[PDB]
Amino acid sequence: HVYNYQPCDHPRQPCDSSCPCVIAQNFCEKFCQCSSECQNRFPGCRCKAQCNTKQCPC
Amino acid sequence: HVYNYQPCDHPRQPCDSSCPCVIAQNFCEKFCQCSSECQNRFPGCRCKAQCNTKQCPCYLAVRECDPDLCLTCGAADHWDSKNVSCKNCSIQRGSKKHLLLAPSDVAGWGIFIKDP
Ligand SMILES: [Zn+2]
Ligand SMILES: [Zn+2]
Ligand SMILES: [Zn+2]
Ligand SMILES: [Zn+2]
Ligand SMILES: [Zn+2]
Ligand SMILES: [Zn+2]
Ligand SMILES: [Zn+2]
Ligand SMILES: [Zn+2]
Ligand SMILES: [Zn+2]
Ligand SMILES: [Zn+2]
Ligand SMILES: [Zn+2]
């Protein structure tokens, strides 16, 4: 069910159940026009190095 | 719908739609008898330190860093010592702030914090 990511550009509307990223089950990215603290925005991992194990959320 | 975690003890049956942890929407822990590569097992975060921001999967999932899994964040290291590198381990380690007991300014007794 993976869909291509397309940045969200819905002003005056939260990224919830109506943003294209939320509908397409895709995390909001830095290119999204939503707020910097969006619920669907994917947080950056804080791994020391490698980031190749399953532990790294990325 | 948060349910209490009870270790799974179903051998010869994958942790899938029938294990109590999977049914209860709860991650399999080290105390589960399932396989060491279970799908529902919660992986240990590889955070450099702190683990207090939303990026750390333990903090992101409202979970304290498991000492057996999270080894880079410092939860496992310095078990006898204090000032752990990770910050999502205070409940498990029991490092609580010094409270003080005095009559509350609102009603009855109240807890007052000794240090900022
Ligand atoms: Zn959006
Ligand atoms: Zn978006
Ligand atoms: Zn968003
Ligand atoms: Zn990352
Ligand atoms: Zn990483
Ligand atoms: Zn199980
Ligand atoms: Zn389990
Ligand atoms: Zn399991
Ligand atoms: Zn962490
Ligand atoms: Zn952790
Ligand atoms: Zn940690």
Curated annotation (Swiss-Prot), chain B:
Signal peptide span: none
Primary role: Polycomb group (PcG) protein. Catalytic subunit of the PRC2/EED-EZH2 complex, which methylates 'Lys-9' (H3K9me) and 'Lys-27' (H3K27me) of histone H3, leading to transcriptional repression of the affected target gene. Able to mono-, di- and trimethylate 'Lys-27' of histone H3 to form H3K27me1, H3K27me2 and H3K27me3, respectively. Displays a preference for substrates with less methylation, loses activity when progressively more methyl groups are incorporated into H3K27, H3K27me0 > H3K27me1 > H3K27me2.
Assembly and interaction partners: Component of the PRC2/EED-EZH2 complex, which includes EED, EZH2, SUZ12, RBBP4 and RBBP7 and possibly AEBP2. The minimum components required for methyltransferase activity of the PRC2/EED-EZH2 complex are EED, EZH2 and SUZ12. The PRC2 complex may also interact with DNMT1, DNMT3A, DNMT3B and PHF1 via the EZH2 subunit and with SIRT1 via the SUZ12 subunit. Interacts with HDAC1 and HDAC2. Binds ATRX via the SET domain. Interacts with PRAME. Interacts with CDYL. Interacts with CLOCK, BMAL1 and CRY1. Interacts with DNMT3L; the interaction is direct.
Cellular localisation: Nucleus
Entry superkingdom: Eukaryota
Protein source organism: Homo sapiens
Disorder association: Weaver syndrome: A syndrome of accelerated growth and osseous maturation, unusual craniofacial appearance, hoarse and low-pitched cry, and hypertonia with camptodactyly. Distinguishing features of Weaver syndrome include broad forehead and face, ocular hypertelorism, prominent wide philtrum, micrognathia, deep horizontal chin groove, and deep-set nails. In addition, carpal bone development is advanced over the rest of the hand.
Induction entry: Expression is induced by E2F1, E2F2 and E2F3. Expression is reduced in cells subject to numerous types of stress including UV-, IR- and bleomycin-induced DNA damage and by activation of p53/TP53.
Post-translational modification: Phosphorylated by AKT1. Phosphorylation by AKT1 reduces methyltransferase activity. Sumoylated.
Organs and tissues of expression: In the ovary, expressed in primordial follicles and oocytes and also in external follicle cells (at protein level). Expressed in many tissues. Overexpressed in numerous tumor types including carcinomas of the breast, colon, larynx, lymphoma and testis.
This protein's name: Histone-lysine N-methyltransferase EZH2
Family the UniProt entry places it in: Belongs to the class V-like SAM-binding methyltransferase superfamily. Histone-lysine methyltransferase family. EZ subfamily.
Domain CXC: start-end pairs: 1-90
